[PDB]
Ligand binder design. Structure first.
Ligand SMILES: Nc1ncnc2c1ncn2[C@@H]1O[C@H](CSCC[C@H](N)C(=O)O)[C@@H](O)[C@H]1O
Lengths: 239, 5
């Protein structure tokens, strides 16, 4: 018996007692976010979330975690996207992300909406998640840029996208990573993340200290859209 | 090539 903690490179973790087969299965398993405070407590089978409820990790005694459930009836489950399905509940936000970022008009002229921090945090802090449908590089690189505003490479085999009309918050808010604008002097980077609901995706992690209400930006790393080429020239100058 | 990296 005993308790087992599995920490992912991104900071998140799975905690619980493994069954006779040594698998994280039961009604009291939990995924704990990188803040080591926010958690999804409930039913998991072999580490996969079946029915998790929002909870707060109060403390840990000799490896034993003590959770307190958050008021509400919102349950979460593994819900990895496909090429055509972005989410089973596109309007159910991620609790960890909801407490750290919000969408508003960007401070970047003519950029549209942007992603902003709700709190002051230090370097290397995971702030948002970049979930989306999963498609191939061939499909993406073979179509017009007008359709690739939200495409993000996950790896050599998969591209994550937030296609219309999901690029509108009123239609999709399960994750908000696609709302962060570009900057050649970014305060964040896209990083790998293993999410209990979204599965393998990317997240937005700060590179340094960020203040409350500061706009979060990332270097797109782009051949690229016109607005990008223009900004690039404007950057190479006055730099 | 037409995606963020
Ligand atoms: N530095 C920048 N300058 C102008 N537009 C930018 C920009 N960074 C991002 N964008 C804009 O945002 C798109 C990427 S998605 C970021 C979210 C978007 N501004 C929105 O309101 O949904 C790009 O296609 C471009 O239109």
């Amino acid at each position: 018996h005993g308790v087992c903690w599995i920490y992912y490179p991104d900071g998140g973790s799975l905690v619980g007692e493994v069954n006779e087969d040594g698998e994280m299965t039961g009604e009291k398993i939990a995924y704990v976010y990188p803040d080591e405070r926010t958690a999804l407590y409930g039913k998991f089978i072999d580490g996969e979330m079946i029915e998790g409820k929002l909870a707060t990790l109060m403390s840990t005694e000799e490896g034993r975690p003590h959770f307190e459930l958050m008021p509400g009836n919102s349950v979460y489950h593994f819900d990895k996207s496909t090429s055509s399905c972005i989410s089973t509940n596109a309007l159910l936000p991620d609790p960890y992300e909801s407490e750290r970022v919000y969408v508003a008009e960007s401070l970047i002229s003519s950029a549209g909406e942007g992603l902003f921090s709700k709190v002051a945090v230090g370097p290397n802090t995971v702030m948002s998640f970049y979930n989306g449908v999963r498609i191939t590089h061939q499909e993406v690189d073979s179509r017009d840029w007008a359709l690739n505003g939200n495409t993000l490479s996950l790896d050599e085999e998969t591209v994550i996208d937030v296609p219309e009309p999901y690029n509108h918050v009123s239609k999709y808010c399960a994750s908000l990573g696609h709302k962060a604008n570009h900057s050649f002097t970014p305060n964040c980077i896209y990083d790998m993340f293993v999410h209990p609901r979204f599965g393998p995706i990317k997240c937005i992690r700060t590179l340094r200290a960020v203040e409350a209400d500061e706009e979060l930006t990332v270097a797109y790393g782009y051949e690229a859209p016109e607005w990008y080429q223009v900004e690039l020239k404007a950057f190479q100058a006055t730099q | 090539k037409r995606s963020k990296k």
